[PDB]
Amino acid sequence: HVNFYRNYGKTFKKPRRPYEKERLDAELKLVGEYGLRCKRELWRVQYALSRIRNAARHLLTLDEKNPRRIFEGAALLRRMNRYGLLAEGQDKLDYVLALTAENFLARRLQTLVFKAGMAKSIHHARVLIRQRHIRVGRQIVNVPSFMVRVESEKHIDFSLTSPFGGGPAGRVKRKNQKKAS
Amino acid sequence: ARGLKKHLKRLNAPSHWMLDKLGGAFAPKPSSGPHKARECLPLILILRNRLKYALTYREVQSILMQRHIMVDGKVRTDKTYPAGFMDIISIPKTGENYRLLYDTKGRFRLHSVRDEDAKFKLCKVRSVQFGQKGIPYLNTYDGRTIRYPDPLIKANDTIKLDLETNKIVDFIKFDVGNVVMVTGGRNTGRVGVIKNREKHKGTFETIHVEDAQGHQFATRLGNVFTIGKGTKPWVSLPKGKGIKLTIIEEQRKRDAAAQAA
RNA sequence: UCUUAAGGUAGCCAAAUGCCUCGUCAUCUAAUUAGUGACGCGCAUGAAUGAAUUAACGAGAUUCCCACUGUCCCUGUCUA
RNA sequence: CCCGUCGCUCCUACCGAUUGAAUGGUCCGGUGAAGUGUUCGGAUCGCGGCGACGGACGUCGCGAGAAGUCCAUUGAACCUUAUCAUUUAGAGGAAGCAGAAGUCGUAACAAGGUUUCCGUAGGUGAACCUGCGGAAGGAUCAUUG
RNA sequence: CUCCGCCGGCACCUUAUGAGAAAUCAAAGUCUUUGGGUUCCGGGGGGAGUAUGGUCGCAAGGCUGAAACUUAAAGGAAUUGA
RNA sequence: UACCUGGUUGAUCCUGCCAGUAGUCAUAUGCUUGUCUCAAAGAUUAAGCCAUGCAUGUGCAAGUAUGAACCAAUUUGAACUGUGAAACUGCGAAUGGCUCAUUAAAUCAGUUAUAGUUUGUUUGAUGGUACGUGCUACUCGGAUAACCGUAGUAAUUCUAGAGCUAAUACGUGCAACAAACCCCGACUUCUGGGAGGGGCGCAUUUAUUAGAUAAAUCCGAUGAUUCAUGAUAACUCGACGGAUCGCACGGCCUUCGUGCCGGCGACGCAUCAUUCAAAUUUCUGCCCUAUCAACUUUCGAUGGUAGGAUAGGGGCCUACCAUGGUGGUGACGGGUGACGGAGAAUUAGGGUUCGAUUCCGGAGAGGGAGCCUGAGAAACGGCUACCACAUCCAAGGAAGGCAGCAGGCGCGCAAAUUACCCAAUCCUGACACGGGGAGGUAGUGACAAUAAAUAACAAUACCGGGCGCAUUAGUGUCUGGUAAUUGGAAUGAGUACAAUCUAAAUCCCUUAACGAGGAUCCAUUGGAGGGCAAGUCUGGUGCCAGCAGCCGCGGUAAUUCCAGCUCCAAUAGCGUAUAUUUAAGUUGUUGCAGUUAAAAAGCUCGUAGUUGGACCUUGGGCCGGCCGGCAUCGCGCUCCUAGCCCGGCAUCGUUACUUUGAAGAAAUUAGAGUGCUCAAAGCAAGCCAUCGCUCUGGAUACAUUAGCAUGGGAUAACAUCAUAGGA
Ligand SMILES: [Mg+2]
Ligand SMILES: [Mg+2]
Ligand SMILES: [Mg+2]
Ligand SMILES: [Mg+2]
Ligand SMILES: [Mg+2]
Ligand SMILES: [Mg+2]
Ligand SMILES: [Mg+2]
Ligand SMILES: [Mg+2]
Ligand SMILES: [Mg+2]
Ligand SMILES: [Mg+2]
Ligand SMILES: [Mg+2]
Ligand SMILES: [Mg+2]
Ligand SMILES: [Mg+2]
Ligand SMILES: [Mg+2]
Ligand SMILES: [Mg+2]
Ligand SMILES: [Mg+2]
Ligand SMILES: [Mg+2]
Ligand SMILES: [Mg+2]
Ligand SMILES: [Mg+2]
Ligand SMILES: [Mg+2]
Ligand SMILES: [Mg+2]
Ligand SMILES: [Mg+2]
Ligand SMILES: [Mg+2]
Ligand SMILES: [Mg+2]
Ligand SMILES: [Mg+2]
Ligand SMILES: [Mg+2]
Ligand SMILES: [Mg+2]
Ligand SMILES: [Mg+2]
Ligand SMILES: [Mg+2]
Ligand SMILES: [Mg+2]
Ligand SMILES: [Mg+2]
Ligand SMILES: [Mg+2]
Ligand SMILES: [Mg+2]
Ligand SMILES: [Mg+2]
Ligand SMILES: [Mg+2]
Ligand SMILES: [Mg+2]
Ligand SMILES: [Mg+2]
Ligand SMILES: [Mg+2]
Ligand SMILES: [Mg+2]
Ligand SMILES: [Mg+2]
């Protein structure tokens, strides 16, 4: 029976010590300050960070001039630079270890909407994402964890169908208009 | 089990067939033929997966039963035919010739050739020995048997065969310093010049080859294949002139192709 | 508490020693006053009157199982 | 604070006559289906030689060929004994634990009122006592006073 | 017999700069800066050095030796009090 | 994320466990559930039992057609013209699929070997004499199914008989030289012969012979062979060496006669090679158990010889002989709720546990045993027999095998539709058309995994902290909220025209019109003493009911029970149970401990085992910018690699260790590229004027142990120049 063969895995991990004031309030800091749906999203971010830091740690373990070191060091660095998650003049493969979950949370599309305006709130940013109000190049995106690359960051803009930036007015508009008319 | 296995499952398929994983349960199961059937490509993989002239099993069946697809001088309507190394696949309606060679990363390309270097093929010999009534004959890794061999053509050597006279026209003596290209393992695809050959009693003979630009490697005898005498090949090499390039180098090629446009 | 010189110790048992007695329980059997194994306030067990076991042996006593059979159902016939 | 016997309730396991019992296997032997191979066998069925005979007959040409049968070989399957293993019954005997608001003591912890204890032997309702040797985990790191 | 020095003994007195839960130890040190070699041996307290099996013994017994079940402590060193 | 926290005490420092904490592609269950993507699902218990239906059949121009049909329809000569259903023949049914019962050096993995073997087929090459006294081929047989007809039986793809008719079924039987050579051999002349004529394909077996050397006219392979192969003498009651079938016609008369003829195929016989493979087979490697120390051997155990059998090696078996084989380096035996592996969970490292299951290998089809056909089977969707089970019987008989798909019973903590489909992936057949419960699609599916809704924004307000003076005020900025307050915006859940999807529907993706007032388009799970986050709230109960993983709470003021408010952690998920990983430096090789907490044997000897003192030149240099080559006080090389007399050449102690190389199945994992919208994923896809095509990718790593190969000789074992039997 094929389609048994389609792989799939887990994306987060529940924390080791469930009830800690320090971690609990730090995670509430982050979840409220980025307006997230729950702490699953945050835990995905530590999982991705854990993955990349394991890779970077293993790369730093080796020595330079080692072709394995150079190759996926450069691959990891160009991945980071495509996500703009490192700044210019900062490609050293240690500033990958330096970065923290705030960096990933800052690239999510909600945050980018908030920082480009067009939301008037970060929770308003999330909802605008999920009501098909925003495209990237031409395709309307509704996943608030979209992880925009800088080559797409410049022209993140409304859809051509959303009432705010595109075409016809919404259903509340048209009910009010038709009962006025 | 209790007989020959007549189904082949896609994951069990050779890794150089490139074929995907959710594409189905089964793979073409290349029929018994003239080439080693783990080192081969079915003509269904030649048609549907590489050239895309069809889109289904049945459309490839239409292709082959039209009698167009002609291999090695004679049409082969089998849809699991084990076409392999320097088999020439011709199509009269497209007037288009192909020859099957390894590319440097261990897989099979269909290199176009014109008619003059499609009138003939080139293959290595397995062994030359006598037969009934003392008539000598030689055996090739393409399976072909040739009687009355030239008294100098010996084992492991290479021979050209036209498709009309259907016999030998010339032969490369497998020896030190002639260009080869490995046909199996991790070094397969890479052409190069034999630079040394050491023999150990009772085991595989080791062939040390040097590529056209400095790199050196080793290989077992069953995998190497002389092409031409000296450095010059007697066959049209693919877009990579048999040099396997390190991953860093191939990253630089794509970076340079990006920054050139 | 009376009393003895001492109060039946180790054991052991309805044992060939237990009257009550066909003791009580379990096992054996369709059925057992029999057999074995336990229980012991034992009419009246017991320590070289030797006590308790004990492989081998027994023309020793007792119970059961298998084979075998006119011992029996049930007699018949043959021979000297 | 605390040790043990005894009395009671409950749990768990032990020994235990019962030629105990059940399930499953394994081995030897007895019997042996069936197939394969083999020996004889010859139901019928093929130029239907020849008599130069009137679709017939005997001499018939050899070859096929079934039932049956013989001897091997593989050998299920049943039967008896032996034996292994897993569970399970057992009058009675005797352990451990848990419980409670029990009886008898005072064994141990102070020099615990007989210092404690280890090995071995005997005894006693119970803890325990004593004999011989040892140790301090002693109540003495000490006789030049 | 007095003095001084070597080895090899049995020990002792002072001190941590060490070690240790401490008591204490110049060997129980050179241990999280963890590795000289080697044998035996422990894995909470009971049940228990018990049952069963084996084996040795004249016997007492010795060597080898579980489980079920039960339990939340048992235990070591030192402090204060009684 | 390389981690700890509560409990022995009046308190302290410990050894130490108990409990907590987290995961499980790990099952059950409880509560709950709106959307998308993905997709395990009668393995654990019963390799227990099965109603029903299906799952393997097959047709081209090319083996067989007025037996009976359909379409053409005849100048009434001949066709059966063309379509062919039934049937014969051939081939496949030995694959697929399902399960894990048996099985612990056995299967299996890595690595060999077959010079020790069979292999339908593919692909390629290949093939004289059939009798004629080797002096060029020499003759054509009935019967059989389907059909027609008569029947038994209650009966089944049970079954007898009559009449017909074929072959690529069956059975016969024409043969292409010089005969090259081999042996006989009349006479001639003497022969060393001429020889006149008489005996000789390919396969099978046996036997002889050849299959060639070394420096002063020899010619295949191997690392290794009496090998490949040749010649010979024969030998077989010889399998074989074509009585087959298609179209397209089309050069030219010898008797102008379908005439001399001729190509392209289909099938088929045999041989060799190839391939698909198989079957054996070498080395090393597997869990627990010593309350499993001896096991094997009369009857095969270990070996030898000769044979038999096999396709083939072989005690596989037989006859004879020898007395051997394994073991404290764990045999034999026993357990396994044990198929092996790729791998899964967890992981700082090391590890621990698991692996029925979709990939590979093995084994079974109720339990054993035995065989036909066939290239391939000890087949079970084949047969025969027994045993267990069971069905129909008209009571004689007959049919059996779901651990195939679905479904039913039982067993259980535990597991879905008696659906659709050949369109994809492939397989299969005589085959472009048939078939395919393989396989895909759909329904049930909180197994697991992914994205991710349940509101957002504004001023009003009793208000609530600075900031404009900050006094003395007062209202002010992000809005913080009790606001069912007020307000218009946004949308998908859902409904749904349509289209798209699809083999046909369905889902998804698009989207006409509909689709939010906060009561609803309502989020739950568990907890609120400590650990451990969150009540020194209120009412009830009163050592009861009950809670509580542990410590403990409850004996009338319960922070602990039963309730309400509030709150908390997680959130479409969470609790519970068991097993397992972590914690656990509480299994410790890294990495524990033994005076007193559990633990040094009473003491010594002692074999295996483990461990073993020091010592042997690369000592100093050049040379060119980590190393080549050099020289010094370098046992030689004839031969391949061998200088513009000369670097860097064979054989004449083992191993470990270590470097590099090869071969190493994919899937899994790591990891490169790639905007499935992200993500789990997947292996695609991206750019042309996104107008009759370009550029393509579909990397790379790991892979311990065993094996092969190259460089080193420090470290470590073995063997050993003192009899010189040395060079
Ligand atoms: Mg199979
Ligand atoms: Mg008495
Ligand atoms: Mg009595
Ligand atoms: Mg009697
Ligand atoms: Mg008695
Ligand atoms: Mg008396
Ligand atoms: Mg008396
Ligand atoms: Mg006396
Ligand atoms: Mg007396
Ligand atoms: Mg006292
Ligand atoms: Mg005392
Ligand atoms: Mg005392
Ligand atoms: Mg006394
Ligand atoms: Mg006295
Ligand atoms: Mg004391
Ligand atoms: Mg213990
Ligand atoms: Mg103490
Ligand atoms: Mg750890
Ligand atoms: Mg205590
Ligand atoms: Mg207390
Ligand atoms: Mg625990
Ligand atoms: Mg099982
Ligand atoms: Mg069954
Ligand atoms: Mg032999
Ligand atoms: Mg099993
Ligand atoms: Mg399998
Ligand atoms: Mg089978
Ligand atoms: Mg079978
Ligand atoms: Mg079946
Ligand atoms: Mg089924
Ligand atoms: Mg609640
Ligand atoms: Mg509660
Ligand atoms: Mg409450
Ligand atoms: Mg708290
Ligand atoms: Mg609880
Ligand atoms: Mg609580
Ligand atoms: Mg410890
Ligand atoms: Mg002790
Ligand atoms: Mg001692
Ligand atoms: Mg020794």
Look up residue A89 and give its two tokens: 């003049």
Q: Pairing relation of β-strands B88-91 and B96-103?
A: antiparallel
The C-alpha atoms of residue B107 and residue B77 are separated, in whole angstroms, by: 24
The C-alpha atoms of residue A122 and residue A125 are separated, in whole angstroms, by: 5
Binding-site annotation: residue ranges of B for Mg(2+)? 29
The C-alpha atoms of residue B28 and residue B57 are separated, in whole angstroms, by: 9
Binding-site annotation: residue ranges of B? 29
- Closest-CA residue of chain A to B25: A2
* Residues 88-117 of chain A sitting with CB below 7 angstroms of strand F: none
- Which member of B22, B246, B251 has the closest CB to residue A6? B22
The count of residues in chain B is 261
Listed as own residue / partner, the contacts of A154-159 with beta carbons closer than 8 Å and 24 or more positions apart are A156/A109, A156/A112, A156/A113, A156/A116, A158/A118, A158/A133, A158/A134, A159/A132, A159/A133, A159/A134, A159/A135
A65 CB and strand F closer than 7 A: no
Q: How far is the CA of A18 from the C1' of D141 (A)?
A: 58
Torsion angle of C-alpha atoms B221, B224, B228, B234, degrees rounded to 10: 150
Q: Give me the total of CB pairs closer than 8 Å, taking one residue from chain A and one from chain B.
A: 18
Per the entry, the structure determination technique was: cryo-EM
With an 8 Å Cβ cutoff, the interface of chain A facing chain B consists of: 1-3, 5-6, 67, 70-71, 74
E runs forming strands in chain A: 134-135, 157-158
Question: Residue A4: its chain B contacts at CB < 8 A?
Answer: none
Nucleic acid strand F: bases within 7 A of protein CB: 1, 3, 21-25, 38-41, 93-98, 113, 120-126, 202-203, 220-223, 228-231, 271-277, 358-363, 375-380, 423-428, 432-433, 438-441, 448-458, 479, 488-492, 510-511, 514-516, 532-534, 569-572, 574, 661-673, 675, 677-684, 696, 698-701, 708-710
Look up residue B251 and give its two tokens: 């990253």
Element (H, E) at B122: strand B120-130
The C-alpha atoms of residue A158 and residue A162 are separated, in whole angstroms, by: 7
Q: How far is the CA of A4 from the C1' of F448 (A)?
A: 12
Q: How far is the CA of A63 from the C1' of F151 (A)?
A: 98
Q: Specify the nucleotide whose C1' lies closest to residue B28 (CA).
A: F426
Q: What is the largest CA-CA distance in chain A?
A: 76
Look up residue A103 and give its two tokens: 């960096």
Look up residue A54 and give its two tokens: 């394991």
The C-alpha atoms of residue B170 and residue B192 are separated, in whole angstroms, by: 21
- Closest-CA residue of chain B to A67: B248
